[PDB]
Structure formats: structure tokens, C-alpha cells
Amino acid sequence: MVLSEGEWQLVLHVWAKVEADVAGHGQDILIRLFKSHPETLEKFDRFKHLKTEAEMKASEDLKKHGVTVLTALGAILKKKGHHEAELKPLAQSHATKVKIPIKYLEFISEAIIHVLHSRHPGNFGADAQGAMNKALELFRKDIAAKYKELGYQG
């Protein structure tokens, strides 16, 4: 699909707020996902053992992984649709190194939206949430088409 410049602006305006605290946002989102959808935790042989939110909150490995996730996602969004190059190694690692179905991308999309709504209500009204949801669907559909070229679902 295609985002208008107005929509991208709404996306990058909240994101600028997120980047004020990348690790904290990273943590909130991954724990939102693990609680909300515990089966997702199973994909990480690194975190598999964390039993309660308190254990999640205090794992430094998890917080680090959350910076990595948000730094790569931020890089893609800042490309404003021209993210072919950024998408290729992402799709490869999530389709053959480990296999992450599109369903799970939807779940983490939902957690991102959850967290932005909680921490940035004045910058995350309805218009801003629809733009962000548009940006994430575009990511997922492009990733899905890449998955398919690489030999996996999509």
C-alpha cells in the first residue's frame, strides 16, 4: 500500500518521543507481548525460562534485545516506505534462522500500539493510531511477500 506524507508525519512524530527512551519502550513492548501471547515466548530459547513479569523486568538480556528490535524497526519507518534493503536480512533471519509466522508479527504490532497508547496519549489519538497501524500493516505485507520468496509461508 502507500502512506501519505501526512500519515508518515504522525508516525515519525510519536516515534521521536519513543526514541527519548529506547530501552524502556523495548522492555514494555516485549513484556506486553509475552504476557498477552505466552506462546511467543517459546520462540526465544534465550528467554524461555522467564516465568513472571518481575523476572522479565530484571533480565538485562531482554532489555538489550528490545533495543535491537526497536532500532531496526525505527530504521525501517524512517525510510518512509522505501525499505527493501532493510527488509531483506530481517525476513531472512526470521524465516530460516528461526521461523516467525505472520500471526506473531501481528501480535507484536498490537503490543506496540498498546504501549504507545499508554505512554503517549496526547500524541496518539485516533488519527495517529491509524497511521501507525497503516505503517505496520505495510511492514507485515512486505515481510510476508519476502517470506514467500525465501521459501516460507508469507
Q: What's the DSSP call for residue 110?
A: H
User: Shortest Cβ contact with ligand HEM: which residue?
Assistant: 93
Q: Which is nearer to ligand HEM, 8 or 104 (CB)?
A: 104
Q: Does 23 interact with ligand HEM (rule: CB under 6 A)?
A: no
Is the CB of residue 22 less than 8 Å from the CB of residue 67? yes
- Determine the Cα–Cα distance for residues 100 and 104; give it in Å rounded to an integer: 7
* Least distance from ligand HEM to the Cβ atom of residue 89, Å: 7
Q: Does 8 interact with ligand HEM (rule: CB under 6 A)?
A: no
Smallest Cα–Cα separation from 149: which of 90, 91, 101?
Answer: 91
Q: Does 31 interact with ligand HEM (rule: CB under 6 A)?
A: no
Write the interaction track for ligand HEM spanning residues 39-78; mark x where CB under 6 A is met and - where it is not. -x--xx-x---------------------xx--xx-----
- Determine the Cα–Cα distance for residues 124 and 25; give it in Å rounded to an integer: 15
- Determine the Cα–Cα distance for residues 71 and 89; give it in Å rounded to an integer: 14
User: Binding-site residues, please?
Assistant: 65, 94
Q: Which is nearer to ligand HEM, 97 or 122 (CB)?
A: 97
Task: Name the H helices within the chain.
Answer: 5-18, 22-36, 53-58, 60-77, 84-92, 102-119, 126-150
Smallest Cα–Cα separation from 98: which of 135, 43, 27?
Answer: 43
Q: Does 99 interact with ligand HEM (rule: CB under 6 A)?
A: no
Q: Does 88 interact with ligand HEM (rule: CB under 6 A)?
A: no
* Least distance from ligand HEM to the Cβ atom of residue 121, Å: 22
In the complex, the residues that contact ligand HEM under the rule CB under 6 A are: 40, 43-44, 46, 68-69, 72-73, 93-94, 98, 100, 104-105, 108
